[PDB]
Amino acid sequence: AFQLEMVTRETVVIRLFGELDHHAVEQIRAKISTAIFQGAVTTIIWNFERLSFMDSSGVGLVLGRMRELEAVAGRTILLNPSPTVRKVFQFSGLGPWMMDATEEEAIDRVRGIVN
């Protein structure tokens, strides 16, 4: 399961629970790609706290959104991966986007503390 929540007009949090199946991957892709192209989403905070398993389809979902964000000066954070999920990201080359923090901290820090 997943939760999509616009915190600001430009920042969305995507909360994942359990495992993603193809229906969920396609709904996320559809909704979030539209939000980037015909909206103003420029930051995605993926909260993996409750995701128990991630496979190549999940990785591809994340990276396809990274390509969309590249056209709008966007940013991605992979928040709170579990040990197993963290391993999949590291093996896949996505380790550099990982963060262990609260959702509030991640949003405050995404492009550096605002001041």
CB 92 within 8 A of CB 61: no
Distance CA 76, CA 46 (A): 8
Distance CA 30, CA 17 (A): 19
Q: What kind of experiment solved this structure?
A: X-ray
Resolution (A): 1.6
| CATH no. of 1-115 | 3.30.750.24
Q: What φ, ψ does residue 26 adopt, rounded to 5°?
A: -70, -40
What is the helix (H) or strand (E) element at residue 83, kind and residue range? helix 83-92
- Phi-psi map region of 80: left, alpha, beta (phi>0 left; psi -120 to 50 alpha): left
Residue closest to 101 by CA, chosen among 49, 62, 50: 49
Which of left, alpha, beta for 8 (phi over 0: left; psi -120 to 50: alpha)?
A: beta
| Domain residue ranges in the chain | 1-115
Sequence-separated (6 or more) residues with CB below 8 Å from residue 71 = 36
Closest CA to 19 of 61, 55, 56, 59: 55
Rounded Cα gap, residues 42 and 49, in angstroms: 22
